Design a protein around this ligand. Sequence first.
Ligand code: SF4
Ligand SMILES: [Cl-]
Ligand SMILES: [Zn+2]
Length: 160
Amino acid sequence: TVLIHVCCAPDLLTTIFHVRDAEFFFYNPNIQPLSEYEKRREAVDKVANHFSLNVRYGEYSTEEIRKWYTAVKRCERCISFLLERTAQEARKRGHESFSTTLLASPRKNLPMIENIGKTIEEKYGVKFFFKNFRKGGAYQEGVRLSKELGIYRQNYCGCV
Ligand code: SF4
Ligand SMILES: [Cl-]
Ligand SMILES: [Zn+2]
């Protein structure tokens, strides 16, 4: 079983075209202010209820945001912070692998994410699952499903 960090609903939609049995982990203290975190969270919840996904919602609090701010090249930091928490959760909950929907994400740097994931794997002993999540047309498939579900598609990465 694989625990997949979720950044946003559009990238979750792309991802679920190809992953069959996952637990998802919405953890993003980088997203501010609270109204934007909640907007993104509610869109993920809408996708999860539509497709009966198993999503867990991580901590979002003043403290959690301070931990992230202390951590943040800055995107390398940010992504490593999110995936470290994910791999910690994967070990706690007995998942032998972890991944992230950031791999679906058209803007992001696939080599940098795979490098971070492999480094975190070596630290925690949870296998990092890499996939070209946009491949298989899945990306345009995620767009079509976003439109259909009327899913919030954001306009910036999340942080201030
Ligand atoms: S742009 Fe995105 S990846 Fe880079 S620091 Fe901000 S939230 Fe993190
Ligand atoms: Cl994103
Ligand atoms: Zn995303």
